[PDB]
Amino acid sequence: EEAPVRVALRVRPLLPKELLHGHQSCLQVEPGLGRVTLGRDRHFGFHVVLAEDAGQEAVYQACVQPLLEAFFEGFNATVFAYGQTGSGKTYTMGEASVASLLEDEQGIVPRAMAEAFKLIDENDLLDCLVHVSYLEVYKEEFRDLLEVGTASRDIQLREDERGNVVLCGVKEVDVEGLDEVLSLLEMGNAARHLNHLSSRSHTVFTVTLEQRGRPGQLLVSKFHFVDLAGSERVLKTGSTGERLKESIQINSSLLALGNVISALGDPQRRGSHIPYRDSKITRILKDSLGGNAKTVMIACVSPSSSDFDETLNTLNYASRAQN
Amino acid sequence: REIVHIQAGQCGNQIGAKFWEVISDEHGIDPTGSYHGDSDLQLERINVYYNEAAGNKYVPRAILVDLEPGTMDSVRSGPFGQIFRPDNFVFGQSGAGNNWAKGHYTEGAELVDSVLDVVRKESESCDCLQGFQLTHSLGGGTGSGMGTLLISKIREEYPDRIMNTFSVVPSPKVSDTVVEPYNATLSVHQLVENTDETYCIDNEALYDICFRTLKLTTPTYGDLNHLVSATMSGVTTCLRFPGQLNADLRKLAVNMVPFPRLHFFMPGFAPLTSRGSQQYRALTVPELTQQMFDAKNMMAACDPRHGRYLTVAAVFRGRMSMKEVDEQMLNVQNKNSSYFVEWIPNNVKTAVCDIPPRGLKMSATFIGNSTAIQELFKRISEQFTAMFRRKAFLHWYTGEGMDEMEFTEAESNMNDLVSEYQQYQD
Amino acid sequence: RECISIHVGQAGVQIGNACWELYCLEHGIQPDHVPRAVFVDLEPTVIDEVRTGTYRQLFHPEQLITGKEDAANNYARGHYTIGKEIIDLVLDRIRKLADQCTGLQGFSVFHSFGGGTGSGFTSLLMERLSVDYGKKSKLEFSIYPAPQVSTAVVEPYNSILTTHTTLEHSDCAFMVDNEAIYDICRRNLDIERPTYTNLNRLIGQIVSSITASLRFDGALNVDLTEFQTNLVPYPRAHFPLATYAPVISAEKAYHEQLSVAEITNACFEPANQMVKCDPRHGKYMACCLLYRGDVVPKDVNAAIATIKTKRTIQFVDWCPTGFKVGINYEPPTVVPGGDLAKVQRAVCMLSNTTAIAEAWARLDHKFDLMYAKRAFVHWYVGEGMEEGEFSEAREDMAALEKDYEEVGVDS
Numbered sequence A: 001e002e003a004p005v006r007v008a009l010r011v012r013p014l015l016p017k018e019l020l021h022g023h024q025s026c027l028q029v030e031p032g033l034g035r036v037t038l039g040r041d042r043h044f045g046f047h048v049v050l051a052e053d054a055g056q057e058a059v060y061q062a063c064v065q066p067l068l069e070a071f072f073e074g075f076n077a078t079v080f081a082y083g084q085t086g087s088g089k090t091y092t093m094g095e096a097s098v099a100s101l102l103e104d105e106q107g108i109v110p111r112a113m114a115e116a117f118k119l120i121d122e123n124d125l126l127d128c129l130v131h132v133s134y135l136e137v138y139k140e141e142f143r144d145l146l147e148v149g150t151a152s153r154d155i156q157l158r159e160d161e162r163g164n165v166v167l168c169g170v171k172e173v174d175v176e177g178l179d180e181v182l183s184l185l186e187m188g189n190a191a192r193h194l195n196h197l198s199s200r201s202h203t204v205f206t207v208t209l210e211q212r213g214r215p216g217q218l219l220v221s222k223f224h225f226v227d228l229a230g231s232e233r234v235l236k237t238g239s240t241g242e243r244l245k246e247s248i249q250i251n252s253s254l255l256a257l258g259n260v261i262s263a264l265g266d267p268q269r270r271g272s273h274i275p276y277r278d279s280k281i282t283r284i285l286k287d288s289l290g291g292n293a294k295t296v297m298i299a300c301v302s303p304s305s306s307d308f309d310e311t312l313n314t315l316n317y318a319s320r321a322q323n
Numbered sequence B: 001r002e003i004v005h006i007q008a009g010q011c012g013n014q015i016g017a018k019f020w021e022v023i024s025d026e027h028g029i030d031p032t033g034s035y036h037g038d039s040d041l042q043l044e045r046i047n048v049y050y051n052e053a054a055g056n057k058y059v060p061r062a063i064l065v066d067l068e069p070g071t072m073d074s075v076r077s078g079p080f081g082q083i084f085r086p087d088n089f090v091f092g093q094s095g096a097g098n099n100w101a102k103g104h105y106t107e108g109a110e111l112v113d114s115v116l117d118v119v120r121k122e123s124e125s126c127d128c129l130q131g132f133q134l135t136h137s138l139g140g141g142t143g144s145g146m147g148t149l150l151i152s153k154i155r156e157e158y159p160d161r162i163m164n165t166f167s168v169v170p171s172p173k174v175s176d177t178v179v180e181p182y183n184a185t186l187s188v189h190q191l192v193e194n195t196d197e198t199y200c201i202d203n204e205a206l207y208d209i210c211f212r213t214l215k216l217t218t219p220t221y222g223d224l225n226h227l228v229s230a231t232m233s234g235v236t237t238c239l240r241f242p243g244q245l246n247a248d249l250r251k252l253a254v255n256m257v258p259f260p261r262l263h264f265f266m267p268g269f270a271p272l273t274s275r276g277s278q279q280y281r282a283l284t285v286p287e288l289t290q291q292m293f294d295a296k297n298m299m300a301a302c303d304p305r306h307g308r309y310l311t312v313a314a315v316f317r318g319r320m321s322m323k324e325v326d327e328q329m330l331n332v333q334n335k336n337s338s339y340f341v342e343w344i345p346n347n348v349k350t351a352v353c354d355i356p357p358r359g360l361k362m363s364a365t366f367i368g369n370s371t372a373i374q375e376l377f378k379r380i381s382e383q384f385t386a387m388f389r390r391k392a393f394l395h396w397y398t399g400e401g402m403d404e405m406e407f408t409e410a411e412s413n414m415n416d417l418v419s420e421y422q423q424y425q426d
Numbered sequence C: 001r002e003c004i005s006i007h008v009g010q011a012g013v014q015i016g017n018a019c020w021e022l023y024c025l026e027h028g029i030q031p032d033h034v035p036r037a038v039f040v041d042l043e044p045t046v047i048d049e050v051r052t053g054t055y056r057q058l059f060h061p062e063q064l065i066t067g068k069e070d071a072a073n074n075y076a077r078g079h080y081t082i083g084k085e086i087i088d089l090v091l092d093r094i095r096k097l098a099d100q101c102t103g104l105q106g107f108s109v110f111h112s113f114g115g116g117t118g119s120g121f122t123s124l125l126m127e128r129l130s131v132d133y134g135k136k137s138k139l140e141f142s143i144y145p146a147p148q149v150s151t152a153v154v155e156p157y158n159s160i161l162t163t164h165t166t167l168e169h170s171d172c173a174f175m176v177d178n179e180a181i182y183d184i185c186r187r188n189l190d191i192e193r194p195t196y197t198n199l200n201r202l203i204g205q206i207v208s209s210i211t212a213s214l215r216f217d218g219a220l221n222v223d224l225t226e227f228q229t230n231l232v233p234y235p236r237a238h239f240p241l242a243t244y245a246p247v248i249s250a251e252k253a254y255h256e257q258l259s260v261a262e263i264t265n266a267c268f269e270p271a272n273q274m275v276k277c278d279p280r281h282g283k284y285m286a287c288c289l290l291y292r293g294d295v296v297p298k299d300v301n302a303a304i305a306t307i308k309t310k311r312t313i314q315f316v317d318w319c320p321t322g323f324k325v326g327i328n329y330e331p332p333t334v335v336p337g338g339d340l341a342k343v344q345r346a347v348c349m350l351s352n353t354t355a356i357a358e359a360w361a362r363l364d365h366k367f368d369l370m371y372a373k374r375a376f377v378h379w380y381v382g383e384g385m386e387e388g389e390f391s392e393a394r395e396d397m398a399a400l401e402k403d404y405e406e407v408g409v410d411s
């Protein structure tokens, strides 16, 4: 009675800063084939393979809009943006990016919020008003990005007897217009923390709309724009100095998350209790893993051969994606 | 290497007062005077627990905190109540609320900053900071609410050094006042995320060791805290004397945890003999060996044999040979190998001192991590959800701003802590 | 030329204490001119052993480089940041000594796999040396772990992550395990109190016969480079087995029939070679024998002959050209508190075999078991490593044991 975790992958286009320096296309982009050739023998399974010239509406209609229909089930649905440092996770969902000419430069977030105001227009039956939150996961500490300052001793999480997670110390603002939504995304992305200048912390944007089941059994539905971090592993040659200390603490949280998600599909040697409690980005995604709640995996890789094994490590992120 | 000291709670003063009996005797220190130890090797790394700001004197780098003054007022009247710089005292004449949250949200909360000024004056007072010793109790709010309030602010302040948690878990039947167990739950809900080492102790274990193995029939509490002073005098500055293979706090931290859940530790001390009756002509490291691993001589509530052994480190104190150490550790790897879980081959961690204590020829220091502590917190769970169901002591905590939703989160977090202990008891 | 070495690691420091002690006794060195090394540790305690009592005045103390931060016995910490503060200072001290010496002969590296201390600091230390002085002699030297007499909880991980890269930056390497030395002190030195410092006098004895006697008056003095050409038929830096044979105590030597063939033959009994992977089936590919004292060649060309004509101690078939012998003149020297019994002739053997890969398997599969539950990942990824580092270590030793495999029985 449980639907499996849907598995998708994205290839980014190649920038001239890696093209002219000789980074050959180690990947084999095969979007319609449902698979991707790496090297000469690595052939992996993916439901939706995204080419390096794909459209954000096609990304929106392959995974997100089928969960937007499933958001009206009154149940959870979660899609993140995974990749290594420099994979384009900013472009993947479409926040902290303001061009808005062709409108394909911004991605899923104005499409799902603009379409969310489109769905307020039709379904005028259920009493519904959406409030969202926009938080930071930084050095295993939280920060209300919608506020210029809030105590870390105040911003803590909760857990009930039903089995959910409640936030505290979080500025919650309802929606009235996509101008207000992009105003909160603008002020929040300005309040986040070079060009990206760290691309470091997790920026978590949770959309919340309870669906009043029909003065009765309340049916809660949440949808999740959880933007992940860069997944540099090897890099002795990258993050140095004090900025070494910025990279190193979240780097343990990365394989903490990978240690969590790989404890489900492999029961071969006493597959023990799932340690969601180890990291603060994992307890917020305990609801985002398994069960009647929905989760679809989308990751962004690089065509550069220098991150080749790292791309395979991203594929190792994707190989153990079962459920 | 430098470490500051913390005594919170009405219990805690004594919790470590006896320690400040011991270690000053370990270096040859008067109540007022100086380094009168005859051996120069009692001096060479005293900076881990000490400073010299009046110069000729000695000062324990220590911060003594209570929410009711008369306890530490009795301490400063004690025999070692003059060796403190009394400006290091931080307290108040507030009502020391027996609520956890009243020491965690209101009373000490307007005394936190007064503590933090002394931890910052004392932290960068001298050379590079090494670790923190948290001596308190869970038996009430005073060591627990202000305790994890302190160190929960401290890890936000200092994300770097080591947090040693001397907790006092209540004994599973010999209670104190039956309002008790909530002062475990909300405390330990905010222990595991804000420490990396927790040496938990248990009361009826103290009566078990003091009352039976030592044949003294009258367990004075100063003798109990004297035994805990033998523990922490066993652990750290023992390694900060010369040692053949001498570890630190950080090595023990990386050793005895599988995971960052850190799986709170259970200490023991080997030579436990009655006073004059135990002429024995068989006292050496070896004895410490079989003495360490029995069901008694354990400061834990549950029987340690009842689960596996994940990691056990030992700190042997005496002029001795590692062949007749590591051979004995091989014996423990053999004769008890069923409950000595297989998939880590070295559950042992050898630690070698060079010095005895003041009178004994040879001692030893047990630090343990079984899986058996599963049936401690489950015990603490089983009482917790028992008289949570009546909701009958709910008003004292609601009246201090603590809300409803916190409790069930604490139940789930300590709950699946117990569940993963079961998942690795195997 | 009177060669200048390094010592990191606590056992490396104390093994230089007794080793360097036997140095500064056997050449007639008074307890008050020239010391010829450096001592590095990530805690000033172990150095403050030597920096306090005896053998304190006999150094110019402006070179005993210490780090007042954590001892930090975990690999990824000791390779990265916590030794990064000190590595440059060590480099400038050793290049200052490189300039002060004239015609430096090589590097012998005393450290340990047994902790993070002499593992990653040693790893990029040797890496930085091969960047600096790659056209030199590199003789790394760690104490190999015990297979079941082990000490650390992370007992694989330091060694496993070390051999990931310490192979590519030295050629000759000597690894000796503790347990059989406990068998020697227990049995053949015949005492039941085996001390760390007595072990240190034993390795200090064998290194005391590697080079200081071989730079003393020897008629068949051997170059250090003749080790790194003789002992390996392949350029893949492998590692032999070294054993000092005359381990009799003071009560034993009312034993007037004691000659070169005795300890010569005793170099080849299997439970004496100071490693717990005895030549049950290890075909020898290389054997350098270094003798000292009044050595008679009759035991040489009768005893070594009947070793090779035993045909029970079978060499490598396809590559059997495995002898290299040199004899010094000077006898060894009695440590005044020591245990060796003033022997008028002595043999330090060494021999690269087949067997060590099995010992590596003793470390390997053990290493896999604690990897099998993803156990200690959070410390090392908490210091700057990842899953792929462990995987490259595992594949690295996986190819290594097959390189040890095909040279032997495969003829």
Ligand SMILES: CC(=O)O[C@H]1C(=O)[C@@]2(C)[C@H]([C@H](OC(=O)c3ccccc3)[C@]3(O)C[C@H](OC(=O)[C@H](O)[C@@H](NC(=O)c4ccccc4)c4ccccc4)C(C)=C1C3(C)C)[C@]1(OC(C)=O)CO[C@@H]1C[C@@H]2O
Residues within 6 Å of the ligand: B021, B022, B023, B025, B026, B222, B223, B224, B226, B227, B229, B230, B231, B233, B234, B271, B272, B273, B274, B275, B276, B356, B357, B358, B359, B360, B363
């Ligand atoms: C004549 C003689 O040898 O007396 C011994 C003695 O009889 C025995 C029984 C001691 C004695 O300890 C106790 O009776 C005891 C009392 C309360 C709680 C715990 C223990 C002793 O009091 C304790 C004392 O311990 C020390 O001196 C250590 O350095 C110890 N010191 C303290 O605990 C201490 C006590 C008072 C004031 C300051 C310090 C220590 C241990 C570990 C780390 C640091 C210090 C010793 C050897 C003895 C006496 C004096 C009788 C024993 O304990 C210790 C900790 O050594 C109890 O079993 C051991 C075996 C000893 O042989």
Ligand SMILES: Nc1nc2c(ncn2[C@@H]2O[C@H](COP(=O)(O)OP(=O)(O)OP(=O)(O)O)[C@@H](O)[C@H]2O)c(=O)[nH]1
Residues within 6 Å of the ligand: B244, B245, B246, B247, B248, C008, C009, C010, C011, C012, C014, C042, C043, C046, C071, C072, C073, C111, C112, C113, C114, C115, C116, C117, C118, C143, C151, C152, C178, C196, C197, C199, C200
């Ligand atoms: N043979 C021998 N081995 C030793 C001796 N001392 C330590 N060892 C082994 O070496 C391992 C650790 O290597 P060391 O260099 O001595 O210790 P370390 O890593 O420097 O520890 P720290 O000084 O705290 O950093 C231990 O596990 C011991 O098994 C010794 O004196 N002789």
Ligand SMILES: Nc1ncnc2c1ncn2[C@@H]1O[C@H](COP(=O)(O)OP(=O)(O)NP(=O)(O)O)[C@@H](O)[C@H]1O
Residues within 6 Å of the ligand: A011, A012, A013, A015, A083, A084, A085, A086, A087, A088, A089, A090, A091, A196, A199, A200, A228, A229, A230
């Ligand atoms: N699939 C992609 N599509 C369009 N632009 C991309 C893509 N990938 C990378 N880029 C561009 O190249 C740069 C690198 O992307 P970037 O998002 O900064 O890396 P990142 O690791 O994902 N950082 P972050 O999203 O903040 O965690 C950006 O300016 C992108 O516009």
Ligand SMILES: Nc1nc2c(ncn2[C@@H]2O[C@H](COP(=O)(O)OP(=O)(O)O)[C@@H](O)[C@H]2O)c(=O)[nH]1
Residues within 6 Å of the ligand: B009, B010, B011, B012, B014, B096, B097, B098, B137, B138, B139, B140, B141, B142, B143, B168, B176, B203, B221, B222, B224, B225
């Ligand atoms: N070992 C030891 N434990 C004690 C002693 N006195 C009290 N305790 C335990 O510690 C707890 C007291 O903590 P405390 O701060 O004094 O109580 P609170 O003021 O209400 O928080 C009690 O539950 C006792 O079980 C003592 O002298 N020695």
